Amino acid sequence: LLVEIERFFKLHQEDQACATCLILACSTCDREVSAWATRAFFRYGGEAQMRFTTLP
Amino acid sequence: EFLHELEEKMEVARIQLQIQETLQRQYSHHSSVQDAVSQLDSELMDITKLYGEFADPFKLAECKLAIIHCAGYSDPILVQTLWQDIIEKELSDSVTLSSSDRMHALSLKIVLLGKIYAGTPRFFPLDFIVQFLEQQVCTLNWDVGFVIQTMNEIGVPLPRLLEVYDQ
Numbered sequence: 001l002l003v004e005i006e007r008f009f010k011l012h013q014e015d016q017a018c019a020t021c022l023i024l025a026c027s028t029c030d031r032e033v034s035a036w037a038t039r040a041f042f043r044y045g046g047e048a049q050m051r052f053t054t055l056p
Numbered sequence: 057e058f059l060h061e062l063e064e065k066m067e068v069a070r071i072q073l074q075i076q077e078t079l080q081r082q083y084s085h086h087s088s089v090q091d092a093v094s095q096l097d098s099e100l101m102d103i104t105k106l107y108g109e110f111a112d113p114f115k116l117a118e119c120k121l122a123i124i125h126c127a128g129y130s131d132p133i134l135v136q137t138l139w140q141d142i143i144e145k146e147l148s149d150s151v152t153l154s155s156s157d158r159m160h161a162l163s164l165k166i167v168l169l170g171k172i173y174a175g176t177p178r179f180f181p182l183d184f185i186v187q188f189l190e191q192q193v194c195t196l197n198w199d200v201g202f203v204i205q206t207m208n209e210i211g212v213p214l215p216r217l218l219e220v221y222d223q
Binding site: 003004044047048049 | 077080081083148149157161
């Protein structure tokens with residue numbers, strides 16, 4: 001799903017997606033693309049799509 | 057000359073890969089219109105075809121810019137006009153809190169395209185571009201060096217940046 005992670009998001013939920021995203025980023029032997037993308041998702045979520053946030 | 061054909065091929069092929077990658081991220085797309093991907097993977101395409109058909113309709117400004125690099129299309133107005141669109145599009149998505157966040161994303165987007173084009177002056181008029189960027193970012197919180205750092209990261213040399221900036 002790295003390229004579309006909405007599907008993961010939908011089924012699993014946002015929190016879980018974030019957690020997995022963190023693991024992929026940290027995960028060792030991974031391609032830079034994967035780690036960077038996961039880092040990007042973790043940090044910024046999906047641009048103009050899913051936003052990453054504290055809500056009152 | 058065989059080499060000539062091979063390298064050009066690699067370049068054009070790469071573009072399709074990029075366009076293909078973006079198509080996945082883009083949410084404007086429908087899965088059933090898979091046909092586009094089939095077309096992309098299927099073969100090398102005419103540059104104009106790639107430009108007119110893909111870049112414009114899917115508003116991939118970056119791709120369009122890179123493509124014109126390979127084409128080596130010099131026309132400054134058209135090149136600049138394309139740049140204006142990219143910048144304008146960027147503004148749309150932003151919300152403000154992410155001044156820093158957007159700051160990074162903006163630098164990220166620019167640097168990537170910048171690395172590819174920066175070697176040639178036509179797409180990357182350093183002279184024209186720098187102010188343009190500053191002007192854009194100006195309607196945002198600012199830290200000095202934010203604009204220039206991107207160009208340095210872009211691949212521009214300190215010496216090149218210095219003379220133009222001084223000018």
